[PDB]
Ligand binder design. Structure first.
Ligand SMILES: CC(=O)N[C@H]1[C@H]([C@H](O)[C@H](O)CO)OC(C(=O)O)=C[C@@H]1NC(=N)N
Ligand SMILES: [Ca+2]
Ligand code: NA
Ligand code: NA
Length: 755
């Protein structure tokens, strides 16, 4: 909430009384409206008496200011004397700066509860207009900092005892003469509620093309629970501000229009601001109302998916939801030959004296020893697919010496491809096609086997492959037809077990296989539009991207979901690389990255920070509740940043919770990273308390802070640059009430520099 006086000659607001301020003069103290040079100002003439203006605040407003902070901004020039007192008192305490011209004619400041004056300006500048700012940060030991034309003058100013209760400006002394002219006074109370608990899971973005336009999101939760609870209906809600996040329009339910029979929960609103179109595109998860991500109750035959809505900033209009599920929710049979091998084989009756064809639609997720094989009673043909050290897609053929690089561009490397073997009876050789393109011809090797086989073939070579289709054809008839894309999404009365469908399973060591994915979910926070991708091969400026949560069957991980055409069509990247170990029980010990946020670094690399849910220890190594990852190819693939986990955020909470990360760019061209998360109470303990703000000035190698932003409850949060000097924060607080902070980043960062 903002309380202000703005000097203007406009007869409709041409004095402080007309703007709700109370006159508080004594004796010969007075004031008058002046028009020095086109710029109106209120001239406070505190000669022979006091001359000030006051604004009263309620008990609640004072309490809010104490919990969530406040800031006071004055534009004034001092003409003469002293006791120029612009300050805030809450009934028990005040921070009182006292501004004056000293006996040398210089502009100086003192603070009650402190000895000493500081010279702010000398010479002609002493009596010119300046911007004076007081910023109060909450906490158990809260303090204020004072800035002069944007520069930190005094930090850690302790509030002092006062029974006064008001916002005050002018000359607050009967005895001490003081004259000053005021253009503007602003007092802002931080932390206004924008979405009420038990609604949850906030996110926020701002428009750079139309300054002042801010759009925030949350889950409307009827019944107050996570998605997936029968007879309860969650929707996505949004509000827009057009004055920089001060006032907000009517809460709008985005999804009820596609929830007309109460069958769904929607969750995890993930907005992206696109400056090229000046739009906000927000993606969110759909769940059946009675099954979702928690407890892995969601299954691939259920209507989990992802939808998006578009906000046109110029017109203020919302575009109806659009389903992108088929583009981003993979349906496949997945074989993870991690620490083992798993193959499926069936005997066939191929005639090697007739042509035959096989089609396999296969994605290589990682590793090697991933095979598709046909033997026709005379010869055996096996294609082994792998990802090499540099991230290329490689085929090796039996009986052929040299490997074939099928693709080196990382996006295409991890995509599905259409493999076709065309056997020619005439030539007694087989031609390999990939995505319609003739690759090579080879004779395979002599064999009396007659079968088709696929999977991961070696217990000593890790590999994961996903299969959508395996077909074998001869004389126009499909001898074998396995459609995992189809089967993955059928209800459970449909037979899907390969071993009950005429295949033989051959397994060694430990493996995991499944029809998936069970669900995809954009996750909590905002996404980004890329602008520094010039030197990132395969990538493109204007890419829309967010780090989504994918549940394959029982394990969570994160992958990029992105669009290179403004959001019309979407693609998915690879999941985060994570360590694994098989426990004695043939149960998988690994990590589950979930709620994630990313930012584009100066060089076009992407930095990702992820919540690590459930188990955090793999092979005796504790990865903490948070882990950072780096992408060098525009978000297609990632690497785990060793020793860059919760440890880099000093005094961060030790409990799992969603965080936020974002870029901040100053008007002089410089930039740095901001990050928000609860500190816990006390800081560094497990608790959704006391939101902290961390800074990185070296592209995410180290973090400074935290600066405490909130006193009390603090859970999920999201931070975004509002303008050249401020960032806007939305944060869950008491009873999950979601509150707005508008933070003077360029002022606050000075608390972290040399003193
Ligand atoms: C999809 C979903 O239900 N996500 C949960 C999330 C989840 O339970 C944990 O990350 C465990 O995997 O945590 C909780 C949480 O407050 O810890 C909020 C999220 N609620 C909503 N996004 N609505
Ligand atoms: Ca987040
Ligand atoms: Na006076
Ligand atoms: Na529900």
């Amino acid at each position: 909430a903002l309380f202000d006086y703005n000097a203007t000659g406009d007869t409709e607001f041409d004095s402080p009384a007309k703007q709700g301020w109370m006159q508080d003069n004594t004796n010969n103290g007075s004031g008058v409206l002046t028009n020095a040079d086109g710029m109106p100002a209120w001239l406070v003439q505190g000669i022979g008496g006091r001359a000030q203006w006051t604004y009263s605040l309620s008990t609640n407003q004072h309490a809010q200011a104490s919990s969530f902070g406040w800031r006071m901004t004055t534009e004034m020039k001092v003409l003469s004397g002293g006791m120029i007192t612009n300050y805030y008192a809450n009934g028990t305490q005040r921070v009182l700066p006292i501004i004056s011209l000293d006996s040398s004619g210089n502009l100086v400041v003192e603070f009650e509860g402190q000895t000493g004056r500081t010279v702010l300006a000398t010479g002609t500048a002493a009596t010119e207009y300046h911007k004076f700012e007081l910023v109060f940060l909450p906490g158990s030991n809260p303090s204020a900092s004072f800035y002069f034309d944007g520069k930190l003058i005094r930090d850690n100013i302790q509030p002092t005892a006062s029974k006064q209760n008001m916002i005050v400006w002018g000359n607050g002394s009967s005895n001490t003469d003081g004259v000053a002219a005021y253009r503007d006074i602003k007092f802002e109370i931080q932390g206004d509620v924008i979405f009420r608990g038990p609604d949850r899971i906030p996110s926020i973005v701002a428009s750079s093309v139309t300054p002042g336009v801010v759009t925030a999101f949350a889950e409307k939760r009827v019944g107050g629970g996570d998605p997936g609870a029968l007879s309860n209906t969650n929707d996505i809600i949004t509000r827009t501000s057009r004055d920089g996040g001060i006032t907000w329009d009517t809460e709008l339910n985005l999804t009820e229009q596609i929830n007309v029979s109460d069958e769904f929960d929607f969750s995890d609103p993930r907005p992206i601001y696109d400056p090229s179109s000046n739009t906000v595109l927000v993606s969110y998860a759909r769940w059946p109302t009675d099954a979702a991500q928690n407890g892995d109750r969601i299954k691939p035959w259920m209507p989990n998916g992802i939808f998006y809505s578009v906000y046109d900033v110029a017109s203020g209009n919302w575009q109806a939801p659009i389903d992108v599920t088929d583009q981003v929710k993979e349906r496949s049979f997945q074989i993870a030959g991690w620490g083992g091998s798993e193959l499926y084989r069936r005997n066939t009756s191929l005639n090697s004296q007739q042509d035959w064809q096989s089609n396999a639609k296969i994605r290589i997720v990682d590793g090697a020893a991933n095979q598709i094989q046909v033997a026709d009673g005379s010869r055996k043909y096996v294609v082994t697919l792998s990802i090499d050290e540099s991230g290329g897609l490689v085929a090796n053929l039996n009986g052929v010496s040299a490997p074939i690089i099928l693709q080196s561009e990382h996006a295409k490397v991890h995509s599905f491809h259409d493999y076709e073997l065309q056997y020619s009876a005439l030539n007694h050789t087989t031609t390999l096609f990939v995505d319609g393109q003739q690759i090579t011809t080879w004779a395979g090797e002599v064999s009396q086997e007659n079968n088709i086989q696929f999977g991961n073939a070696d217990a000593q070579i890790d590999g994961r492959l996903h299969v959508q289709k395996i077909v074998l054809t001869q004389q126009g008839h499909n001898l074998v037809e396995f459609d995992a894309f189809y089967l993955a999404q059928q209800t459970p009365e449909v037979e899907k077990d390969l071993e009950k469908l005429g295949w033989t399973k051959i397994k060694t060591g430990n493996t995991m296989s499944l029809y998936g994915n069970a669900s995809v979910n954009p996750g909590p926070g905002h996404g980004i539009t890329l602008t520094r991708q010039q030197n990132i091969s395969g990538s493109q400026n204007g890419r829309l991207i967010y780090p989504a949560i994918v549940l394959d069957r029982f394990f969570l991980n994160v992958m990029s979901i992105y669009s290179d055409d403004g959001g019309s069509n979407w693609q998915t990247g690879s999941t985060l690389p994570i360590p694994f170990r098989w426990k004695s029980s043939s149960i998988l010990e690994t990590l589950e990255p979930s709620e994630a946020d990313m930012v584009e670094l100066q060089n076009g690399d992407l930095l990702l920070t992820a919540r690590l849910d459930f188990n955090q220890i793999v092979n005796g190594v504790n990865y903490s509740p948070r882990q950072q990852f780096l992408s060098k190819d525009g978000g297609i693939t990632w690497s785990l940043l060793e020793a860059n986990n919760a440890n880099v955020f000093s005094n961060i909470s030790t409990g799992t919770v969603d965080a936020s990360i974002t870029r901040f760019e100053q008007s002089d061209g410089s930039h740095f990273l901001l990050f928000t998360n609860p500190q816990g109470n006390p800081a560094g303990t497990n608790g959704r308390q006391n939101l902290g703000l961390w800074f990185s000035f070296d592209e995410g190698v180290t973090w400074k802070g935290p600066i405490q932003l909130v006193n009390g409850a603090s859970a999920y949060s999201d931070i975004y640059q509002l303008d050249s000097e401020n960032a806007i924060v939305i944060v869950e607080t008491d009873n999950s009430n979601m509150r707005i902070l508008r933070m003077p980043i360029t002022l606050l960062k000075q608390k972290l520099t040399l003193s």
